[PDB]
Structure 1
């Protein structure tokens, strides 16, 4: 019970901090550098925090960038591939062999 109460008070305290942007990474660089592009602004070349490895940062992925220093923070789940969007737009009515007559 005591742990719950103290956690509640600290959670009240820690809700007045800035948010973090989401962005798309285009490609990485050497010595812990990546290039990202967030839509309501240009392209930014930034660094990576000490708990994220470059080899995990594949090109064309979603990441979270801090506010003051734009440093890499997390990796967002994913982004829908263009092929999926195109095929959902076309809407081809798939079928199978059992719907064949003569």
Structure 2
């Protein structure tokens, strides 16, 4: 016999070395695609900075200071002069966490709170 065990056997050994070559093409494809995921996420990150660019076009946002919380979920907030804008802040943030007589982060037009500030 001695071919499928020996001649096609070493042909299969050469196929195993070809699997080593596809382990080289394999791991090159791995690390080059991880580099590709890095550039995708970084260029995607400055693309998300272009998503922030509309909030750059917002001219920034103001500084709210709540002095009194109102029970109708419409919080009076002391603003910079010609302010005192009573408003419901954003729905993802509860009202009771916002403690009165403390400074917060407020958008300049939509008047939704971001966070409590020290």
**What range describes the TM-score normalised by the shorter chain of this pair?**
0.5 to 0.7
Normalised by the length of structure 2, the TM-score is 0.55
| Deviant stretches of 4+, over 4 Å | none
Q: Between the two structures, name the one with larger relative contact order (CA 8 Å, sep ≥ 6).
A: 1
Out of 41, 48, 56, which is 1:3 matched to? 41
Higher fraction of helix:
2
Find the aligned partners of 1:45 and 1:69 in 2 and give their Cα distance: 11
RMSD (Å), alpha carbons: 1.9
- String of CA shifts for 1:43-94, please: whole Å, max 9, x gaps: 1111121111122111101112223222x2212321xxxxxxxxxxxxxxxx
Q: Say yes or no: does 1:42 pair with 2:83.
A: yes
Q: Could you list the runs of 5+ residues in structure 2 that have no partner in the other structure? A: 1-37
> Displacement, 1:20?
1.1
Q: Say yes or no: does 1:73 pair with 2:113.
A: yes
Q: Could you list the runs of 5+ residues in structure 1 that have no partner in the other structure? A: 79-102
Normalised by the length of structure 1, the TM-score is 0.62
Higher fraction of strand:
1
